Amino acid sequence: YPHCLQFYLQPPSENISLIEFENLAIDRVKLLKSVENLGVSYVKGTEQYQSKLESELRKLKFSYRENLEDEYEPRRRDHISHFILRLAYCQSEELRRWFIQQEMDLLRFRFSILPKDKIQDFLKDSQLQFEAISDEEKTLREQEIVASSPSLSGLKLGFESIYKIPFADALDLFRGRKVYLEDGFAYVPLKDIVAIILNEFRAKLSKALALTARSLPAVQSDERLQPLLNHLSHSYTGQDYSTQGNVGKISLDQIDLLSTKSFPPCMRQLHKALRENHHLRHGGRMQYGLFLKGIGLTLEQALQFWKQEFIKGKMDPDKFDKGYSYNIRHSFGKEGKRTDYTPFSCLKIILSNPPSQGDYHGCPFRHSDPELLKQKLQSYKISPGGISQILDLVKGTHYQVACQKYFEMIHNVDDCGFSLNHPNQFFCESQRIL
């Protein structure tokens, strides 16, 4: 691992523990998802985006400038993690395109971090040749470079380094007559250099992913990696952490105000439907009950709450006991986990059990058409510009980012300060805002 940036074209051949394998895979998936969401919400160049991604990389300890720690741990972690994700994502074309996009964003960011003085060696360490021109040569050919330069305004040839590259590597660049050539070697600025670098890296990644897709059948035989790699991105949550077992003081009467103040749209509308109809289907009942368990509702409180709501349903309380108290206690209690023991997550709500007629469960953004989204948002009293940007984000299939923006709107803040992946995290952050 000579350099921090690196091109991933040499698979590792070490041995690692299974726990390390899983940790690396999960960490890199979290990093990529964070990169995607951060690029979607912000602009790719603003200092805010760079600082936030710096913080994410520091917390995930994936890369850093050269030092004792960087030599050993972050660089190997990055290498093996990238190749594990290669195994995970080569299954489908959509996954390949998504992986390529986010890896390109990460590489561009890391390149921007990299100080200029080292770029040369990186280009040398990349195993393909790019040569930097001398100051005397730059002074001599400044007029030629400016004349051949793109629509870049003025004759100012600033401190940006200029490099000598074969015309073959700048096909798409010099084909438009927007660069200077000399003896078959082209002189290019930094921005176009990084463009070329990312283009070649994309070609290499596409070829490698195709090869791994072909090679998958040999490696899919393993049974202790199938359940992890099959659904590494599709259906794995990035450390939701809002599991069963939380503590708090929730008053049953207050629930209503909480519902209109600190609930995510899914749970907000589920609660409204419950209150208005005094009944829920199986899926919505399970989802909302699990959410209430997550926020801090104790078993007796939950039983009393559901029983009190069902008395208004005009059905025998003893029937309620014998029928549903068993289910509620089982949900709050013993084995059968991962479907009843654990509160749902935004990813599970979106990707599992789409609602049907007469069913009010599911994420509203994903499961309700834009007209009804606008109706609901109006009923929630959100500014028209907020609604427009929410709809724009939904059209971009960034449902969780849309919910984040909705959080910011209702809480009357600018930045929520996190990345929601679990409704209970929504409620916890809202309560933290009080």
Binding site: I26, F83, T237, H282, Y326
Partner: protein, 481 residues
């Protein structure tokens, strides 16, 4: 060709998922799509639209609609129960009753068990909504459980019949078979013998001798003429009615074998103590856990027992620390017995030795290679791995349509070893509590270098077993080859 077929099939699956639908099964020859629609015409037009869009994406692919199910219970490939929707004229349809793979192989079931299974299947294949079906099934199961528990049920329904392939004395496992036991009893005590090809009738009974159920099998008239012993209701609820119903109800979402046991009687405790935890796991979960926590990871792992040398009192080591809040004390600091003043930390050697034995035993238990059939009705428990094989795993010699799988999975043993190393992983356990001043005070008050060395030795006693532990480490060279 196979690679391209798989690629296009996966693309079609993801596309139809994007269409706000959900696909429940398909292998290169069929695709079951759940429409979430109760209107037949809507379903037909939706099928036409998906066919048209896939056709315009792939010009030469000629897809078509083969059949429609009003309601379907899916369990496996060619294992389901459905109401085939045969479309009649004027848009009306007939719900033909169809079901494949529900056949039962063994005929050793009580008449009451057969009646309960018939009721459950009929209810599930009724057209009423899911909630109504579940409510009816739960009500019937509770009623049956109460009726059996209180003895209201006729005894004649508890009778069991089983054929005899060989002479009663020639069965190698005669101890575990109730019917051959009754055959031997009738041959010895009675007159006319029982030969191969005859059917023997028996009913399980409670003798109070704390024996296995197979040993207590008694003839029906023998039970009727004897009063010292009665019918074993618990056995019938546990492995004569629970199997039949749970074979069908378990797949339904929101209902679990534990829940069925709770409905049926007072089994839940002893049931989950005596329950199979194999089919419950299913990676189908769409975005649930990432890596769990130690509490739910080592829940199934057996706790580390140890006898205190001084007093002999049992000690359980299920975590590095014991107590609540301020008194977060190491489990080895004091003996579990309040009267004993001997700190287990003195007897580390014995501890380590015992640990070895424990892990040793587990390894042997893993290598016994006990295979169990997955169909709850059969649950054949063999050890001779059959050469005959199926798509998923070994084929059950009894159920020519089923799949054996290990009783003690390899990953269960790996989790057990990891739990053993975690019990003594003092350093890592010192990084799980947030309050730093608590860590400082606690470690300065108990975690001296000597006890740290002892804990490290205990870790190593299992880490040396884990190092050679069967792909507990993954080799990248093979993976990326």
């Amino acid at each position: 060709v196979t690679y391209k077929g798989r690629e296009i099939l996966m693309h079609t699956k993801e596309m139809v998922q994007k269409m706000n639908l959900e696909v429940i099964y398909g292998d290169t020859d069929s695709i079951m799509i759940n429409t979430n629609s109760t209107n037949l015409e809507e379903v037909f037009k939706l099928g036409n639209k998906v066919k048209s869009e896939v056709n315009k994406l792939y010009k030469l692919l000629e897809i078509d609609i083969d059949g429609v199910f009003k309601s379907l219970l899916l369990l496996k490939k060619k294992k389901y129960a459905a109401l085939v929707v045969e479309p009649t004229s004027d848009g009306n349809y007939v719900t033909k009753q169809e079901l494949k793979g529900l056949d039962i192989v063994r005929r050793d079931w009580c008449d009451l068990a057969k009646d309960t299974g018939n009721f459950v299947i009929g209810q599930i294949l009724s057209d009423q909504s899911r909630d109504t079906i579940v409510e009816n099934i739960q009500k019937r199961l509770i009623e049956i459980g109460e009726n059996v528990l209180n003895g209201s049920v006729p005894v004649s329904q508890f009778e069991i019949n089983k054929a005899l392939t060989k002479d009663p004395q020639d069965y190698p496992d005669k101890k575990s078979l109730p019917h051959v036991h009754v055959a031997l009893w009738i041959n010895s005590q009675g007159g006319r013998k029982v030969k191969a090809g005859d059917t023997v009738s028996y009913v399980i009974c409670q003798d109070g001798s704390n024996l296995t159920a197979s040993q207590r099998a008694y003839a029906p008239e023998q039970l009727q003429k004897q009063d010292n012993l009665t019918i074993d209701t618990q056995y019938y609820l546990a492995q004569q009615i629970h199997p039949v119903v749970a074979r069908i109800c378990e797949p339904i979402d929101g209902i679990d074998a534990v829940l069925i046991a709770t409905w049926l009687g007072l089994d839940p405790t002893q049931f989950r103590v005596h329950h199979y935890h194999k089919d419950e796991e299913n990676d189908a979960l769409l975005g649930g856990p990432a890596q769990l926590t130690d509490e739910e990871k080592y829940r199934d792992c057996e706790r580390f027992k140890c006898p205190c040398p001084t007093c002999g009192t049992e000690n359980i080591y299920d975590n590095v620390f014991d107590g609540s809040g301020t008194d977060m004390e190491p489990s080895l600091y004091r003996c579990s017995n309040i009267d004993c003043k001997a700190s287990p930390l003195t007897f580390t050697v014995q501890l380590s030795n015992k640990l070895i034995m424990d892990i040793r035993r587990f390894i042997k238990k893993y290598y016994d290679g006990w295979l169990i059939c997955e169909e709850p009705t059969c649950r054949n428990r063999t050890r001779h791995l059959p050469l005959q094989f199926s798509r998923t795993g070994p084929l059950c010699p009894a159920c020519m349509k089923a799949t054996l799988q290990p009783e003690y999975s390899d990953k269960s043993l790996y989790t057990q070893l990891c739990f053993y190393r975690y019990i003594f992983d003092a350093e890592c356990a010192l990084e799980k509590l947030t309050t730093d001043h608590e860590k400082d005070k606690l470690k300065k008050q108990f975690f001296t270098p000597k006890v740290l060395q002892d804990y490290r030795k205990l870790k190593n006693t299992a880490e040396q077993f884990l190092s050679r532990s069967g792909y507990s480490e993954v080799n990248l060279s093979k993976l990326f080859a």
